[PDB]
Amino acid sequence: NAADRVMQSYGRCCASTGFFDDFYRHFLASSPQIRAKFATTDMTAQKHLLRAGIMNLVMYARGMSDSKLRALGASHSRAALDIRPELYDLWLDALLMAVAEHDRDCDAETRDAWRDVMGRGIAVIKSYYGS
Ligand code: HEM
C-alpha cells in the first residue's frame, strides 16, 4: 500500500536528526516567494507544525474524513495565508530531497509513493485557493 510505504519511510525520516531542518533549508532556498512568506515565522515551532501536517496528509490518504484538509485549504487560501498553487510543487520537491537525505532505504518506489500520497492531499488544498 502506498500509504504504508510512506509511513515506513516517514518513521525513518523522523528518526533521523536534521530531517525538518533540511526540509526547510531546501524549501526556503527554492524561491524568494517562500522566503518572503516565512520571514517572520518561528521556524522551530513551524517544524513541529509540519510534522503534524504531513501526518494529517497521510491520515487523509488512509481514509480519514477530508475535514482537516479542507481546513488547511481554507488557511492556505487566497483569503488567508495566500499560498499560490505553484508553490506546492516546490514544497513537494523539497520534501523529496529531505526524504532522499534522511531515509536510508529511499528508492524509486519510496519516492513515487511520497509523490502519490502527498499529491492527493495537495490537490485538495490547492482546490480551495480561489474559493
Ligand atoms: C501540503 C503542503 C503543506 C502543509 C501540509 C502545510 C502545513 C501547514 C500547517 C499545519 C500550518 C500551521 C496551521 C495552518 O495554518 O494550517 C502552516 C502554516 C503556514 N504555511 Fe503551510 N503547509 C503546506 C504548504 C505550504 C506552502 C506550499 C507554503 C508556501 C510558502 C506554506 C506557507 C505557510 C505559511 C507562510 C504559514 C504561516 C507561518 C507563520 O507565519 O507562522 N505552507 N502550514
DSSP of 30-65, one letter per residue? T-HHHHHHTTT--HHHHHHHHHHHHHHHHHHHTT--
Atom of ligand 1 nearest to the CA of 38: 35
Distance from C-alpha of 83 to C-alpha of 73, rounded to nearest angstrom:
10
C-alpha cell at position 93: 520537491
For residue 17, the enclosing domain spans: 1-131
Taking the C-alpha atoms of residue 41 and residue 101, their distance in angstroms, rounded to an integer, is: 25
Looking at residue 80, which CATH number applies to its domain? Answer: 1.10.490.10
Q: Is the CB of 72 under 6 A from ligand 1?
A: yes
How many C-beta neighbours within 10 Å does residue 89 have?
11
Who contacts 85 (Cβ-Cβ below 8 Å, separation ≥6)? 126, 129
In ligand 1, which atom is closest to the CA atom of 72?
16
Experimental method: X-ray
Could you give the number of structural domains in the chain? 1
